[PDB]
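Hey all, quick one. A colleague (J.T.) asked me to put the zinc ion job into the tracker so the inputs and the structure tokens live in one place instead of scattered across chat threads. No bug as far as I know, just bookkeeping. Sequence used:
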Amino acid sequence: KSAVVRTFREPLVIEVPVPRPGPGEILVKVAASGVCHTDLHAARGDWPVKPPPFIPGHEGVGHVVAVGRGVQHVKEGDRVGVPWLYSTCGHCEHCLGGWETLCESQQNTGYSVNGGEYTLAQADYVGKLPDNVGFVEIAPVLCAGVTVYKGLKMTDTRPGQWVVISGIGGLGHMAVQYARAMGLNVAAVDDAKLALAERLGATITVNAMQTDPARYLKQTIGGAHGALVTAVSPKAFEQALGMIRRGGTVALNLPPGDFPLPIFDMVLNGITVRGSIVGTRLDLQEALDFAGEGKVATVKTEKLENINTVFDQMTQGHI
Amino acid sequence: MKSAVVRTFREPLVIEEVPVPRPGPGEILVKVAASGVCHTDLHAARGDWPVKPPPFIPGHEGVGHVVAVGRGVQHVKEGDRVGVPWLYSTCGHCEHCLGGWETLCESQQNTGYSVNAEYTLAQADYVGKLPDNVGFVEIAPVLCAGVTVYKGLKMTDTRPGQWVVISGIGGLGHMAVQYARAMGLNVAAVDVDDAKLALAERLGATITVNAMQTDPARYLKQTIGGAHGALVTAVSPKAFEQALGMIRRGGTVALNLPPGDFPLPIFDMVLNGITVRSIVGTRLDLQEALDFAGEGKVQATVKTEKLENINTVFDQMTQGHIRIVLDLA
Amino acid sequence: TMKSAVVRTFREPLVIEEVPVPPGPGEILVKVAASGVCHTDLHAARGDWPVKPEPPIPGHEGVGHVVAVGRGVQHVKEGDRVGVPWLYSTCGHCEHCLGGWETLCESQQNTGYSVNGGFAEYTLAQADYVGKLPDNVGFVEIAPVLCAGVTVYKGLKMTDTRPGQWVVISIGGLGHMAVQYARAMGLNVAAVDVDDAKLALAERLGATITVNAMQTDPARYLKQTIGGAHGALVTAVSPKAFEQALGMIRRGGTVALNGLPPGDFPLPIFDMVLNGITVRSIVGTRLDLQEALDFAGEGKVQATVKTEKLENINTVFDQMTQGHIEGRIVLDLA
Amino acid sequence: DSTMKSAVVRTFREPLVIEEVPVPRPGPGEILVKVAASGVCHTDLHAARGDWPVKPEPPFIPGHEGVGHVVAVGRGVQHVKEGDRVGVPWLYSTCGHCEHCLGGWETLCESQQNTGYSVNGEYTLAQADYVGKLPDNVGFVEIAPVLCAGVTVYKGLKMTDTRPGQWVVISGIGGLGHMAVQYARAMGLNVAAVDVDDAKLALAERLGATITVNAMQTDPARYLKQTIGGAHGALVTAVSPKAFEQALGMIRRGGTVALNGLPPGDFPLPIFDMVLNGITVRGSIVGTRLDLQEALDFAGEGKVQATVKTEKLENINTVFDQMTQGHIGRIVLDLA
Ligand SMILES: [Zn+2]
Ligand SMILES: [Zn+2]
Ligand SMILES: [Zn+2]
Ligand SMILES: [Zn+2]
Ligand SMILES: [Zn+2]
Ligand SMILES: [Zn+2]
Ligand SMILES: [Zn+2]
Ligand SMILES: [Zn+2]
């Protein structure tokens, strides 16, 4: 029994048979799936790329139960997980160039497949988890952690520089942990989440309600090298745009709004604006290595029965 | 010596005789032979910016002969063919300066803006040694146009053998085509004037497309499958959305300065992982562009004018019929 | 069932014999027209490398028409004009594999060494490690790119050189490809080949500077004209050309080495560490190969080869150890 | 102020003469700085022997690792104030015109003037644009070992093309070794120490070295190929043929070998294993001003702290002999 979406904007229905795996495929008993905004947003079905009934979740981890034909590397019982990436075309320039996250023919778990008691995934797109970190602990890495690490690595930032993380959400606190493990200096925007970040290794904290972030960073850091925007809102977007020094990189981690962007201030200051959706297998494995090295989350455990309500809570903003 | 100056903003420049000052330590006085015209010049004359400049001698695109050297000058001799770029001087202390990114120096002094024809003074370490075989009018438009284009191409993270679009073949457009072809790339032209399109095809453009006749985004997505880089010379909302759409997943938009806040759908960018970025290049950039011009791989097409008809030229710029260079000879 | 030449024993002639043409799941067998001749091929016959093959077919440079598809192959169609590179297959699991650096996979299978080569008219290869050739360039024309061309393109890409800089090529067949490739990449190039017949050919290919190491000194010349080069792609790796290449590079420049001689070469870190010289690789990845293929199909790269028959293969190897060979050779299947 | 007694090289392979010398007056764009503590490098000794083809012109006062107070400013000096805590690096001056200079690669300027070689190093004169602003909370003796050792280390690490979270070997734990460990751990890497001295190895393990290995007791290459599967980078401080072969072997396919020392040997290179494995071998002597300032930021961040012994100028000459004996831990000359 699993939760499935029959129709969009309609509550998920709770028994389906666990299908047999074909050649080069894997059936994995789910131990803990993670909740993403991608999940809710797929559930509403309001996206240009729309997902027949299917099962959400791209953040599932567990034990290997069934292997397909031709499986030689993954053994039955390995602690592994299934990321947003289900499968790529392996033929496009992105795929063949270690940029498979941009494959046009990518199949995404929970969208183009039945995402995360047993889930089927291709053996070459599953992540080997560390042998000493609980499955609930590795859960946010399948989407949040790896996207953060991909953005941070895409912020063209050398160790020992300054980076802003706008909005300390789940992605926020993972981003702080990772940047500190990457050997950078960090700054962010709830005063309690600020305090949590300061305890996490944030060298600077600033509430945008109390004071102005741009002037502060311009009088203390002289502009930051990178800005990782977890919570993309117009206010935090202008703030990010301003908080960066000349030539710095603003990384974006997906509301449907068209945001005004000054073509003057950027060209003058040479600010580069990147966007990062999810990391690759390599990124995923490194993020897992950083988690297993104990350098990196705080999540709340819930039951399948409470899945629908959680989505409602997500719409209310109480999370 | 008589020179044109801005007495007041939005007011025609007065041609008034001005004294040629004496160069101090580390300064050089240079006979101007030909200055080049940028939209930066007109826009500085109107002074319509939070960073406003009076009275100031315009032009950041002047070239000529070394006449007077300062005290302590050892490398540049009296009589060298040199030019003076948009960069007049930097602070040499900020991390941009010390990191070979001096074009981003907070305390940069800009020629024709923060400083002042016939004879101009410049700091000896911010002047570009031009090639000894290319005419002064020919190398003149590179000081801003050429080097900014070359810095944008270098800023597009594009390896040789890939595809790049040039939205609007202006002066900067044809300079960009020449430079990208000398860089060993594949190019496309979105200029809306079929005659400029034909000129680009004659320059080495593998693809040409008028945005009025057909849609560029679908065309490039059905032929090239999206381009790796997009260098926007003429930044307009129409050319901006088409530029955004012309890029393949993971590509870079290079922008070369309208006062509008442009809407951008951040969903399509983050989803496709598109990167959006070069006002002027550094000394290195300038020298490299000059080497490419002296190798005859980049030849510009300019219109020569007299100093007296400057205001008329600005009027033409505002009128939109317009690269132009003034010839002292 | 046809006739093919194979290695029975090392330093012993490849004998021809009819072999059964074996098409596994997710594998592809293609009738080959391109035979590949490389130095790497010959030394597998000598087997002098510590990593030696288990007998029995050489050649990692075969191209032709797709004949047989495996089970589950959906991208490659029967009749596609394709080729098979030095890379037969990787483990697809190591960090090199997972990071688009599959040329460094520990568990790589190489064609002509760990598997059967393109010496037979028909060879089997994994569908995800074959190169789709251009639709307008002859099989004989694209054939030497499968190893020479792509190693060159990977070396140039590994010389950390921005277009409009200077690069030296120390110019055989591999060298002669390298010149074309660098000019199409938009660089300024120089030739340290010591043969004026090859030197003039390089000047005809687009080499801006040429210098014979017997007549004059290259290091002093380049330090008095270019002031040292940014990169040096060494095709023919010999101690003399090694010292020369090292000296010809400017401060901070990159030394590219392509050959594989069995010598331990003296190199003083005084010269390198003082000048900050970086010394770097051969055989590119799938992306690299495809790039070289695009460069050839754009007509910017055109090899010069001599066509031979399969039967004379040992003769060719013999001539190769004799040193009278200069310029790549592709045996025909017409 | 006044004028003061200083140690100088009269002739090569001959002990330094301690004799009173003038404090020269700084011209336009020049600076006179009170010396508070200089650091001792192998570059100094090797310049004293003068055994390099690039030989200096005697007399010349060695030491490229001096820090202290700004005393006199030149004409046109506007950024550095009289009394700033600054230091003078191996780099005295560049030509500011060559492509290396113009491109923020001034460390390779053909016309570079080096302190302690082409110029001298109680008071030293230096160019105002090639001096390092020290952190405002670190003693002079503490920042002294960074001027050549630390910044060359940080430049080598930056020259090892290593992303954070990878593995790097440090061959030989000298002064530069322990500085390298400190920097790599502050850079967020995983480290290994092939120091053969088990006690300095233990110090490295105390510094944050995840792995330690004595090459006398065990084989390093086999160990790293069975534990890490080869390291991404190898920073060689103490360059000897044995540790050179070891470094070459310790790296995984495609890794980068960084070299710090400068022995006069011509070293064999088996380019077959390198070409096979695609190994890159880069040489790196010193960082630039940017590098230097960053290393100082890391020291002022309290993330880097060297261990040095303070000695007197009178026994500096003796120290040279101690180094030739190999009984030498970084050494700093105090002037309290
Ligand atoms: Zn998600
Ligand atoms: Zn794909
Ligand atoms: Zn301009
Ligand atoms: Zn500055
Ligand atoms: Zn070969
Ligand atoms: Zn592998
Ligand atoms: Zn030193
Ligand atoms: Zn210089």
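Adding what we noticed when we looked at it: The interface with chain B takes residues 28, 76, 79, 95-97, 99, 102-105, 129, 288-290, 293 of chain D (CB under 8 Å). Chain D has two domains: 1-147+286-336, 148-285.
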